[PDB]
Design a binder for this molecule. Structure first.
Ligand SMILES: CNC1Cc2ccccc2C1
Lengths: 38, 153
């Protein structure tokens, strides 16, 4: 049995850390909602 | 019931465990299907019942229809409001990549958090939720990339 607990407002943070790259990937989505690489 | 980002917890395991995250907006709670499997949720002494869901999209809404309709613009950085298990909410800014599928293109964020972070919102510069984090793929080098998963309003 599951319950929810508030963790914050949904706001853009002006000086947030920036990271992560930007891959372009061919993917397939199956009937179960799982992504796979092509 | 206040708008905002929420942890999804269970006590049926050892201790209290965070199974995911979601978004309360306009009286509707939004998370990923794989987080709750469509089960009812408790909020205080109140109960939230599922209203809409779809395994293939991996989304579910509670108390009303899916309300989030902002979309990535295809050009600008976004922010993941990651809410990791046991950790304070924190914004991470990133330029999305792209999932290319036979049915069109989807934004994707190359950021790796524990599974319990699923349902964390991804935001545009106006603070609008453009999708939820946590349905994705592992790429050739072993790192994780999440679709920006958005429903229909
Ligand atoms: C190997 N992934 C790490 C990434 C992360 C971030 C916050 C808390 C825990 C963890 C696990």
């Amino acid at each position: 049995d599951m319950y929810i607990e508030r963790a914050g407002d949904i706001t853009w943070e002006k000086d947030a850390e920036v990271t992560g790259n930007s891959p372009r990937l061919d993917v397939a989505l199956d009937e179960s909602g799982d992504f796979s690489l092509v | 019931t206040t708008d905002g980002v929420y942890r999804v917890m269970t006590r049926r395991l050892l201790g209290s465990t965070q199974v995911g995250v979601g978004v309360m907006q306009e009286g509707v709670f939004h998370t990923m299907w794989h987080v709750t499997k469509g089960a009812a949720l408790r909020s205080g002494e109140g109960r939230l019942d599922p209203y809409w869901g779809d395994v293939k999209q991996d989304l579910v809404s509670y108390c009303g229809p899916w309300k989030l309709d902002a979309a990535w613009d295809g050009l600008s950085e976004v922010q993941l409001l990651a809410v990791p298990p046991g950790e304070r909410a924190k914004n991470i800014q990133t330029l999305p990549g792209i999932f290319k599928t036979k049915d069109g293109d989807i934004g994707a964020v190359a950021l790796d958090y524990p599974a319990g972070t699923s349902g964390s919102p991804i935001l545009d510069k106006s603070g609008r939720v453009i999708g939820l984090y946590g349905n994705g793929v592992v790429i050739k080098n072993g790192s994780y990339v999440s679709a920006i998963t958005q429903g229909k309003r």
